[PDB]
Structure 1
């Protein structure tokens, strides 16, 4: 793979959003990945509606503000034949009935690809596909208060991921030989969290925080 990747510089990534007090991180991970793949297919970046997923993707297994899975969101988009734009179907941070309108659909997918559960495979997918939906163990005070640098949490689990986010690149700090490597990760807690709403997550430390345990992207 390339030594570093940052899909923001290629036009694939919308600004950081804020999910508010609703357990919809999975929907923000899913729209981020679908935004990237739609741009890859069309050359146009269009922010997509998390609310559409929160309200409408129950039949695929999602539970609105009580949690969900990015793969279930990609399955909804496939089953439904579409997903509305963020502009047409804005985010309210609470679960309501479905108001999908196919006239405002700006995305589609044909299913999804689950990446093999190791970081070399994840790197190859980030480098060759675009931004990748992942699940991480974010269940630590240290994650809430993250400011800068490469996030490494000694109590992180590679099995108990609880938070959906989006890998938009990877790279290294310091001298390359120091192996000070990170994943560049877009969160959905607004730009006041973290580094402008981003976190650099420990990379190539045997799947730290489970970042490679449940990674996928939609097929467009």
Structure 2
């Protein structure tokens, strides 16, 4: 596998978004993964609608602004036959009536692939071969809220009890040795002002830190 990967440098990733006061990170994680796969398939980067997922995927088990899961979102896109663009179905950060319009669909998936649970090496293979990967993590810490620089490492982090969905866009390392001081490149949905331009480096190969490889998945397009 490559010593480092950064799908942002290849055009696969949209600018950082902001979920605001709605518990929809699962939807931003899912649109980010679908944006990358649609780019890999067509060469066009098109921002996708989180609101479409918030409003319409209750049957699949999502709860809108009260939480959800990325795999359930990919399930909805498969069952639904499509997903609207951000532009045609704008984000308003509250639960609303489903307004899915097939004529505005710009994405599709046939299901999704699961990374083996807990395997950082398996997550590394998927990031390297596929593109950006949806992942769950434990983000419930002030140290995460005020993250700014460096490789994030929080002793209080759980690898099992997770509460946030994010997007792994690559991986890398500090210094000249590719085998140490490793990190995951993670896209958040708290706006560009949060973190490092909306991104965070999470410690890699430090026993599945914050659960990054516990529940990872990507859409099949």
Query: TM > 0.5 between the two?
Result: yes
* Equivalent in the alignment of 1:190: 191
Contact 2:3 2:178 in 1 (8 A): no
- 2:99 counterpart residue number: 99
Aligned position for 1:208: 209
Distance 1:115 1:147 in 2: 29
Q: Which residue of 2 aligns with 1:167?
A: 168
Gaps of 5+ in 2: none
State the Cα distance separating 1:9 from its structure 2 match: 0.7
CA–CA separation in structure 1 for the residues paired with 2:47 and 2:215: 24
Paired residues of 2:18 and 2:191 also in contact (CA < 8 A):
yes
Residue-pair matches, total: 220
Q: Measure the CA separation in 2 of the matches of 1:78 and 1:106.
A: 13
Counterpart of 1:110 in structure 2 is 110
Deviation (angstroms), 1:176 = 1.1
Distance 1:114 1:132 in 2: 10
Q: Counterpart of 1:139?
A: 140
Distance 2:98 2:188 in 1: 25
The root-mean-square deviation of aligned C-alpha atoms, in Å, is 0.8
Is 1:46 the equivalent of 2:28? no
Normalised by the size of structure 2, how large is the TM-score?
0.98
Q: Pairwise mapping of residues 17-166 of structure 1 onto structure 2 (< 5 A)?
A: 17-117=17-117, 118-166=119-167
Unaligned runs of 5+ in 1: none
Question: In structure 2, what is the Cα distance between the partners aligned to 1:141 and 1:193?
Answer: 13
Taking structure 1 as reference, are residues 170 and 177 closer, same or farther at Cα in structure 2, changes over 3 Å only? closer
Runs of 4+ with deviation above 6 angstroms:
none
1:176 paired residue number? 177
Distance in 1 (CA, whole Å) between partners of 2:21 and 2:132 is 25
Shift of the alpha carbon at 1:177? 6.0
Whole-Å separation in 1 of the counterparts to 2:62 and 2:87: 22
